[PDB]
Amino acid sequence: WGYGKHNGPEHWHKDFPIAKGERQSPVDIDTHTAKYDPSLKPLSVSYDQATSLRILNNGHAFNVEFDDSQDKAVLKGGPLDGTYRLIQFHFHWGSLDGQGSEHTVDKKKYAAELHLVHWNTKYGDFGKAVQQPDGLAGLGIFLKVGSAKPGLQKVVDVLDSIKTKGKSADFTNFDPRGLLPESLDYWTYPGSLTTPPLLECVTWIVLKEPISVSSEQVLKFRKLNFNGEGEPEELMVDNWRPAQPLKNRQIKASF
Ligand SMILES: [Hg+2]
Ligand SMILES: [Zn+2]
């Protein structure tokens, strides 16, 4: 699996049958069909005590890893019951600015989409959480092309170092509070991971308001490699998956 012509999302059902699941992700958010639920509480993001360890190129994206041995960076409130621990965040981008996000707003696609992944901390470890229907919380943030995002420059500058598949680099003192929008208004629904094993373990929380990044910021993204150092160079682009069937499921809005 990859995003190639021969191992793209259209081929994952063969290796991971849940690809054709009942609670698959991403999906199209029909803002006119989303149900305003006044029973939804505000989100609570406690990232002031966050501890970043390193950045890694896994061959399909890059991951910014955080120390989740304790409640340093947590997500609670909203549609969730209990605390969720920030284990990692990564992005999805396109080759061009007209595609890249995984979730769509009224069929509209953004340049990129940031996924902040958290696990339910009544299950003790990530491995355990992915065995539960409410094991994970994906915090979805759309990225659009405009003004530069200061808080993202650190990431962009270190990409050089994790150019290829398997490379990693120390990446401590990185504050995630810098990648958040002003408003916390969100849409929520029961989904899955957007990549293999595609576990139908996730509670999606997609923010209304996108963050803006510069053309030259998103540009360094496109310079990453899928391939391993010393292999024919295949640029890491369009590492996103096409929207799936809602299938009866319903999308709630906090606004
Ligand atoms: Hg699950
Ligand atoms: Zn993702």
PDB file of N, CA and C in Angstrom, residues 43-105:
ATOM      1  N   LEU A  43     -14.676  21.993  23.173  1.00  0.00           N
ATOM      2  CA  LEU A  43     -13.486  21.179  23.156  1.00  0.00           C
ATOM      3  C   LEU A  43     -12.525  21.835  24.178  1.00  0.00           C
ATOM      4  N   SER A  44     -11.651  21.027  24.669  1.00  0.00           N
ATOM      5  CA  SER A  44     -10.606  21.428  25.651  1.00  0.00           C
ATOM      6  C   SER A  44      -9.313  20.709  25.225  1.00  0.00           C
ATOM      7  N   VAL A  45      -8.405  21.495  24.799  1.00  0.00           N
ATOM      8  CA  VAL A  45      -7.070  21.152  24.329  1.00  0.00           C
ATOM      9  C   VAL A  45      -6.100  21.691  25.369  1.00  0.00           C
ATOM     10  N   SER A  46      -5.416  20.759  26.053  1.00  0.00           N
ATOM     11  CA  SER A  46      -4.366  21.135  27.067  1.00  0.00           C
ATOM     12  C   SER A  46      -3.029  20.654  26.498  1.00  0.00           C
ATOM     13  N   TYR A  47      -2.361  21.537  25.812  1.00  0.00           N
ATOM     14  CA  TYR A  47      -1.109  21.209  25.209  1.00  0.00           C
ATOM     15  C   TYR A  47       0.016  22.031  25.763  1.00  0.00           C
ATOM     16  N   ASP A  48      -0.239  22.811  26.771  1.00  0.00           N
ATOM     17  CA  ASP A  48       0.816  23.679  27.366  1.00  0.00           C
ATOM     18  C   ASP A  48       2.045  22.934  27.909  1.00  0.00           C
ATOM     19  N   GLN A  49       1.872  21.668  28.256  1.00  0.00           N
ATOM     20  CA  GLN A  49       2.896  20.826  28.806  1.00  0.00           C
ATOM     21  C   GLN A  49       3.385  19.792  27.842  1.00  0.00           C
ATOM     22  N   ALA A  50       3.199  19.963  26.545  1.00  0.00           N
ATOM     23  CA  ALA A  50       3.600  19.070  25.488  1.00  0.00           C
ATOM     24  C   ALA A  50       5.100  18.838  25.387  1.00  0.00           C
ATOM     25  N   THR A  51       5.371  17.584  25.065  1.00  0.00           N
ATOM     26  CA  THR A  51       6.805  17.165  24.890  1.00  0.00           C
ATOM     27  C   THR A  51       6.966  16.368  23.571  1.00  0.00           C
ATOM     28  N   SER A  52       7.623  17.118  22.636  1.00  0.00           N
ATOM     29  CA  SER A  52       7.911  16.546  21.309  1.00  0.00           C
ATOM     30  C   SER A  52       9.318  15.825  21.435  1.00  0.00           C
ATOM     31  N   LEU A  53       9.344  14.659  20.795  1.00  0.00           N
ATOM     32  CA  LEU A  53      10.604  13.870  20.786  1.00  0.00           C
ATOM     33  C   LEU A  53      11.354  13.855  19.495  1.00  0.00           C
ATOM     34  N   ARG A  54      10.651  13.555  18.439  1.00  0.00           N
ATOM     35  CA  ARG A  54      11.256  13.517  17.095  1.00  0.00           C
ATOM     36  C   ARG A  54      10.240  13.565  15.970  1.00  0.00           C
ATOM     37  N   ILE A  55      10.919  13.698  14.794  1.00  0.00           N
ATOM     38  CA  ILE A  55      10.098  13.813  13.485  1.00  0.00           C
ATOM     39  C   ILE A  55      10.608  12.658  12.688  1.00  0.00           C
ATOM     40  N   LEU A  56       9.750  11.935  12.018  1.00  0.00           N
ATOM     41  CA  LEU A  56      10.046  10.800  11.213  1.00  0.00           C
ATOM     42  C   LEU A  56       9.243  10.645   9.913  1.00  0.00           C
ATOM     43  N   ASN A  57       9.971  10.237   8.907  1.00  0.00           N
ATOM     44  CA  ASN A  57       9.450  10.006   7.517  1.00  0.00           C
ATOM     45  C   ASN A  57       9.263   8.458   7.455  1.00  0.00           C
ATOM     46  N   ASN A  58       7.943   8.097   7.517  1.00  0.00           N
ATOM     47  CA  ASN A  58       7.540   6.673   7.520  1.00  0.00           C
ATOM     48  C   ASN A  58       7.324   6.108   6.108  1.00  0.00           C
ATOM     49  N   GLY A  59       7.542   6.911   5.061  1.00  0.00           N
ATOM     50  CA  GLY A  59       7.390   6.498   3.699  1.00  0.00           C
ATOM     51  C   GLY A  59       6.041   6.787   3.048  1.00  0.00           C
ATOM     52  N   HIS A  60       5.133   7.434   3.786  1.00  0.00           N
ATOM     53  CA  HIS A  60       3.795   7.789   3.335  1.00  0.00           C
ATOM     54  C   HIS A  60       3.465   9.187   3.923  1.00  0.00           C
ATOM     55  N   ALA A  61       4.287   9.657   4.828  1.00  0.00           N
ATOM     56  CA  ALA A  61       4.110  10.961   5.483  1.00  0.00           C
ATOM     57  C   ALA A  61       5.244  11.152   6.508  1.00  0.00           C
ATOM     58  N   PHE A  62       5.160  12.222   7.240  1.00  0.00           N
ATOM     59  CA  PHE A  62       6.154  12.467   8.322  1.00  0.00           C
ATOM     60  C   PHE A  62       5.323  12.609   9.614  1.00  0.00           C
ATOM     61  N   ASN A  63       5.872  12.063  10.697  1.00  0.00           N
ATOM     62  CA  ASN A  63       5.267  12.066  12.015  1.00  0.00           C
ATOM     63  C   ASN A  63       6.153  12.792  13.045  1.00  0.00           C
ATOM     64  N   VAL A  64       5.446  13.595  13.766  1.00  0.00           N
ATOM     65  CA  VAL A  64       5.981  14.406  14.903  1.00  0.00           C
ATOM     66  C   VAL A  64       5.418  13.640  16.124  1.00  0.00           C
ATOM     67  N   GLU A  65       6.365  13.005  16.783  1.00  0.00           N
ATOM     68  CA  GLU A  65       6.089  12.174  17.971  1.00  0.00           C
ATOM     69  C   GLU A  65       6.283  12.929  19.266  1.00  0.00           C
ATOM     70  N   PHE A  66       5.379  12.612  20.133  1.00  0.00           N
ATOM     71  CA  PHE A  66       5.236  13.174  21.485  1.00  0.00           C
ATOM     72  C   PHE A  66       5.252  12.080  22.550  1.00  0.00           C
ATOM     73  N   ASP A  67       5.748  12.421  23.713  1.00  0.00           N
ATOM     74  CA  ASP A  67       5.898  11.573  24.887  1.00  0.00           C
ATOM     75  C   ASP A  67       4.538  11.408  25.509  1.00  0.00           C
ATOM     76  N   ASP A  68       3.972  10.229  25.452  1.00  0.00           N
ATOM     77  CA  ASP A  68       2.614   9.994  26.024  1.00  0.00           C
ATOM     78  C   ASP A  68       2.628   9.004  27.165  1.00  0.00           C
ATOM     79  N   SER A  69       3.539   9.229  28.087  1.00  0.00           N
ATOM     80  CA  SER A  69       3.693   8.357  29.295  1.00  0.00           C
ATOM     81  C   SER A  69       2.814   9.042  30.417  1.00  0.00           C
ATOM     82  N   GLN A  70       2.498  10.285  30.170  1.00  0.00           N
ATOM     83  CA  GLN A  70       1.672  11.057  31.141  1.00  0.00           C
ATOM     84  C   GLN A  70       0.834  12.082  30.390  1.00  0.00           C
ATOM     85  N   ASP A  71      -0.139  12.612  31.103  1.00  0.00           N
ATOM     86  CA  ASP A  71      -1.097  13.607  30.602  1.00  0.00           C
ATOM     87  C   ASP A  71      -0.422  14.969  30.417  1.00  0.00           C
ATOM     88  N   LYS A  72       0.414  15.090  29.416  1.00  0.00           N
ATOM     89  CA  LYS A  72       1.090  16.349  29.157  1.00  0.00           C
ATOM     90  C   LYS A  72       0.317  17.206  28.172  1.00  0.00           C
ATOM     91  N   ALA A  73      -0.148  16.522  27.119  1.00  0.00           N
ATOM     92  CA  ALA A  73      -0.983  17.168  26.092  1.00  0.00           C
ATOM     93  C   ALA A  73      -2.226  16.427  25.922  1.00  0.00           C
ATOM     94  N   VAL A  74      -3.356  16.970  26.459  1.00  0.00           N
ATOM     95  CA  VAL A  74      -4.594  16.170  26.297  1.00  0.00           C
ATOM     96  C   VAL A  74      -5.762  16.989  25.696  1.00  0.00           C
ATOM     97  N   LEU A  75      -6.677  16.238  25.167  1.00  0.00           N
ATOM     98  CA  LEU A  75      -7.890  16.600  24.500  1.00  0.00           C
ATOM     99  C   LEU A  75      -9.056  15.952  25.367  1.00  0.00           C
ATOM    100  N   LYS A  76      -9.932  16.737  25.736  1.00  0.00           N
ATOM    101  CA  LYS A  76     -11.120  16.313  26.510  1.00  0.00           C
ATOM    102  C   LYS A  76     -12.290  17.338  26.059  1.00  0.00           C
ATOM    103  N   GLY A  77     -13.437  16.970  26.506  1.00  0.00           N
ATOM    104  CA  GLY A  77     -14.646  17.732  26.231  1.00  0.00           C
ATOM    105  C   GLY A  77     -15.224  17.335  24.884  1.00  0.00           C
ATOM    106  N   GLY A  78     -16.103  18.236  24.408  1.00  0.00           N
ATOM    107  CA  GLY A  78     -16.762  18.071  23.135  1.00  0.00           C
ATOM    108  C   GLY A  78     -17.595  16.792  23.194  1.00  0.00           C
ATOM    109  N   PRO A  79     -17.480  15.998  22.194  1.00  0.00           N
ATOM    110  CA  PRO A  79     -18.189  14.726  22.036  1.00  0.00           C
ATOM    111  C   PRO A  79     -17.557  13.569  22.770  1.00  0.00           C
ATOM    112  N   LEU A  80     -16.322  13.704  23.226  1.00  0.00           N
ATOM    113  CA  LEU A  80     -15.558  12.713  23.961  1.00  0.00           C
ATOM    114  C   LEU A  80     -15.926  12.541  25.431  1.00  0.00           C
ATOM    115  N   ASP A  81     -15.670  11.339  25.872  1.00  0.00           N
ATOM    116  CA  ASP A  81     -15.888  10.960  27.277  1.00  0.00           C
ATOM    117  C   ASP A  81     -14.466  10.488  27.786  1.00  0.00           C
ATOM    118  N   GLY A  82     -13.891  11.354  28.597  1.00  0.00           N
ATOM    119  CA  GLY A  82     -12.616  11.065  29.205  1.00  0.00           C
ATOM    120  C   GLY A  82     -11.516  11.735  28.414  1.00  0.00           C
ATOM    121  N   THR A  83     -10.258  11.543  28.888  1.00  0.00           N
ATOM    122  CA  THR A  83      -9.059  12.067  28.340  1.00  0.00           C
ATOM    123  C   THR A  83      -8.451  11.202  27.225  1.00  0.00           C
ATOM    124  N   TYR A  84      -7.859  11.902  26.314  1.00  0.00           N
ATOM    125  CA  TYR A  84      -7.204  11.322  25.140  1.00  0.00           C
ATOM    126  C   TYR A  84      -5.757  11.873  25.044  1.00  0.00           C
ATOM    127  N   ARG A  85      -4.791  11.059  24.900  1.00  0.00           N
ATOM    128  CA  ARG A  85      -3.405  11.468  24.813  1.00  0.00           C
ATOM    129  C   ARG A  85      -2.813  11.573  23.419  1.00  0.00           C
ATOM    130  N   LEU A  86      -2.272  12.759  23.175  1.00  0.00           N
ATOM    131  CA  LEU A  86      -1.616  13.151  21.931  1.00  0.00           C
ATOM    132  C   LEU A  86      -0.364  12.342  21.806  1.00  0.00           C
ATOM    133  N   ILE A  87      -0.376  11.393  20.864  1.00  0.00           N
ATOM    134  CA  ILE A  87       0.723  10.538  20.570  1.00  0.00           C
ATOM    135  C   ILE A  87       1.514  11.073  19.360  1.00  0.00           C
ATOM    136  N   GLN A  88       0.763  11.602  18.393  1.00  0.00           N
ATOM    137  CA  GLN A  88       1.339  12.157  17.173  1.00  0.00           C
ATOM    138  C   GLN A  88       0.366  12.972  16.338  1.00  0.00           C
ATOM    139  N   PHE A  89       1.027  13.697  15.435  1.00  0.00           N
ATOM    140  CA  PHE A  89       0.389  14.592  14.410  1.00  0.00           C
ATOM    141  C   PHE A  89       1.223  14.426  13.151  1.00  0.00           C
ATOM    142  N   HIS A  90       0.492  14.512  12.069  1.00  0.00           N
ATOM    143  CA  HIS A  90       1.029  14.381  10.667  1.00  0.00           C
ATOM    144  C   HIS A  90       0.052  15.151   9.749  1.00  0.00           C
ATOM    145  N   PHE A  91       0.516  15.237   8.514  1.00  0.00           N
ATOM    146  CA  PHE A  91      -0.253  15.931   7.462  1.00  0.00           C
ATOM    147  C   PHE A  91      -0.504  15.044   6.235  1.00  0.00           C
ATOM    148  N   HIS A  92      -1.380  15.531   5.460  1.00  0.00           N
ATOM    149  CA  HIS A  92      -1.874  15.018   4.173  1.00  0.00           C
ATOM    150  C   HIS A  92      -1.821  16.308   3.240  1.00  0.00           C
ATOM    151  N   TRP A  93      -1.190  16.123   2.098  1.00  0.00           N
ATOM    152  CA  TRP A  93      -1.057  17.252   1.142  1.00  0.00           C
ATOM    153  C   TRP A  93      -1.208  16.770  -0.270  1.00  0.00           C
ATOM    154  N   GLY A  94      -1.413  17.703  -1.169  1.00  0.00           N
ATOM    155  CA  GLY A  94      -1.578  17.398  -2.607  1.00  0.00           C
ATOM    156  C   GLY A  94      -0.320  17.915  -3.322  1.00  0.00           C
ATOM    157  N   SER A  95      -0.262  17.610  -4.634  1.00  0.00           N
ATOM    158  CA  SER A  95       0.778  18.000  -5.517  1.00  0.00           C
ATOM    159  C   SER A  95       0.577  19.472  -5.924  1.00  0.00           C
ATOM    160  N   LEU A  96      -0.658  19.830  -5.973  1.00  0.00           N
ATOM    161  CA  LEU A  96      -1.194  21.153  -6.238  1.00  0.00           C
ATOM    162  C   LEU A  96      -2.059  21.696  -5.065  1.00  0.00           C
ATOM    163  N   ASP A  97      -2.285  22.946  -5.062  1.00  0.00           N
ATOM    164  CA  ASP A  97      -3.097  23.609  -4.014  1.00  0.00           C
ATOM    165  C   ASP A  97      -4.576  23.332  -4.078  1.00  0.00           C
ATOM    166  N   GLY A  98      -5.045  22.707  -5.140  1.00  0.00           N
ATOM    167  CA  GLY A  98      -6.527  22.417  -5.263  1.00  0.00           C
ATOM    168  C   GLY A  98      -6.959  21.107  -4.658  1.00  0.00           C
ATOM    169  N   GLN A  99      -6.016  20.358  -4.133  1.00  0.00           N
ATOM    170  CA  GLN A  99      -6.303  19.037  -3.503  1.00  0.00           C
ATOM    171  C   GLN A  99      -5.278  18.836  -2.385  1.00  0.00           C
ATOM    172  N   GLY A 100      -5.499  17.849  -1.522  1.00  0.00           N
ATOM    173  CA  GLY A 100      -4.613  17.601  -0.422  1.00  0.00           C
ATOM    174  C   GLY A 100      -5.261  17.125   0.865  1.00  0.00           C
ATOM    175  N   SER A 101      -6.412  17.789   1.234  1.00  0.00           N
ATOM    176  CA  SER A 101      -7.143  17.430   2.460  1.00  0.00           C
ATOM    177  C   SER A 101      -7.785  16.034   2.152  1.00  0.00           C
ATOM    178  N   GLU A 102      -8.228  15.472   3.248  1.00  0.00           N
ATOM    179  CA  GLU A 102      -8.929  14.186   3.183  1.00  0.00           C
ATOM    180  C   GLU A 102     -10.419  14.370   3.350  1.00  0.00           C
ATOM    181  N   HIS A 103     -10.763  15.290   4.266  1.00  0.00           N
ATOM    182  CA  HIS A 103     -12.185  15.637   4.543  1.00  0.00           C
ATOM    183  C   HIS A 103     -12.478  16.782   3.601  1.00  0.00           C
ATOM    184  N   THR A 104     -13.727  16.926   3.194  1.00  0.00           N
ATOM    185  CA  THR A 104     -14.222  17.983   2.318  1.00  0.00           C
ATOM    186  C   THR A 104     -15.424  18.675   2.971  1.00  0.00           C
ATOM    187  N   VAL A 105     -15.392  19.961   2.658  1.00  0.00           N
ATOM    188  CA  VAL A 105     -16.545  20.833   3.177  1.00  0.00           C
ATOM    189  C   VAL A 105     -17.377  21.168   1.926  1.00  0.00           C
TER     190      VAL A 105
END
